[PDB]
C-alpha cells in the first residue's frame, strides 16, 4: 500500500511535468494522466482561483513552501479536502525557478 500523500514536478502554470507514483493511492489518478495537464483542471471550480493565487504567492516567496487547502478531484470525480504544499525550487547559482513541487497531504 502507499500513503495518501505525494509530490509532483510542475511549472508555475501548474502543468505536471512528472508526477510521483503515489497519486494512485491518494486520489486514484495515474501519474501519466496528470502529465501535460494543469492542476487547476482537477481542482474544485470555486477554489481554482485560490489554487492559482497560492501558486503565484509561492513564486513571490522563491524558495519557500506554501500549503493551500482546497477540494481536489479524485479518480471518482469527487471533491476531497487536500492540502497541497508547493515549494519553489530556486537555482543556487542565479535567481531562477526551475520547477515547483506539490506535497498533496489529505486533510479529513
Amino acid at each position: 500500500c502507499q500513503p495518501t500523500e505525494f509530490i509532483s514536478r510542475h511549472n508555475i502554470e501548474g502543468i505536471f511535468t512528472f508526477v510521483d507514483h503515489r497519486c494512485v493511492a491518494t486520489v486514484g489518478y495515474q501519474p501519466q494522466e496528470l502529465l501535460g495537464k494543469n492542476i487547476v483542471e482537477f481542482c474544485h471550480p470555486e477554489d481554482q482561483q485560490l489554487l492559482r493565487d497560492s501558486f503565484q504567492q509561492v513564486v513571490k516567496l522563491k524558495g519557500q513552501v506554501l500549503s493551500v487547502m482546497f477540494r481536489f478531484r479524485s479518480k471518482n470525480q469527487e471533491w476531497l479536502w487536500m492540502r497541497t504544499s508547493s515549494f519553489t525550487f530556486q537555482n543556487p547559482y542565479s535567481d531562477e525557478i526551475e520547477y515547483i513541487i506539490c506535497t498533496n497531504t489529505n486533510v479529513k
Binding site: 509530490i7 503515489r22 525550487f89 537555482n91 526551475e98 497531504t105
Partner: protein, 107 residues
C-alpha cells in the same frame, strides 16, 4: 540545478527526484526503500544526523555543503535545505522535503 529529496520514517529515501542520477548516480527508484544512512557520507555523517535532529524540532533548516557520497565513492559538495511537512489529520510529521542545491563538483 536543484534536486528534490524525500525522507520519511528513518529519514530514508521515500522518493528521489530524477535529477539525482545526474549528481550522485543512484537511480531515483533504487534509493526508494533503502536506508539513506547507508551512504550518508563518511566523515560528514555526523553533520547529517545533527542537522536531522535539529530539523525535526525546527521544521525547516538549511544544512551546509557536505560531501554527498556518490554511487562511485565520490563526495559531491552540495547544500541542502530541509522542510518537514506535517499531516493535517493526525497532526504528525509526514515527510521531509529536502531541496538540494548544486554548487560545487564531486570531490
Amino acid at each position: 540545478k536543484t534536486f528534490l529529496s524525500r525522507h520519511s520514517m528513518d529519514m530514508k529515501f521515500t522518493y528521489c527526484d530524477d535529477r539525482i542520477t545526474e549528481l550522485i548516480g543512484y537511480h531515483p527508484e533504487e534509493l526508494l526503500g533503502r536506508s539513506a544512512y547507508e551512504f550518508y557520507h563518511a566523515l560528514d555523517s555526523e553533520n547529517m544526523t545533527k542537522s536531522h535532529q535539529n530539523l525535526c524540532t525546527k521544521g525547516q533548516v538549511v544544512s551546509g555543503q557536505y560531501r554527498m557520497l556518490a554511487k562511485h565513492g565520490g563526495y559531491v559538495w552540495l547544500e541542502t535545505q530541509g522542510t518537514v511537512i506535517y499531516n493535517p489529520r493526525n497532526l504528525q510529521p509526514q515527510c521531509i522535503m529536502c531541496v538540494n542545491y548544486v554548487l560545487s563538483e564531486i570531490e
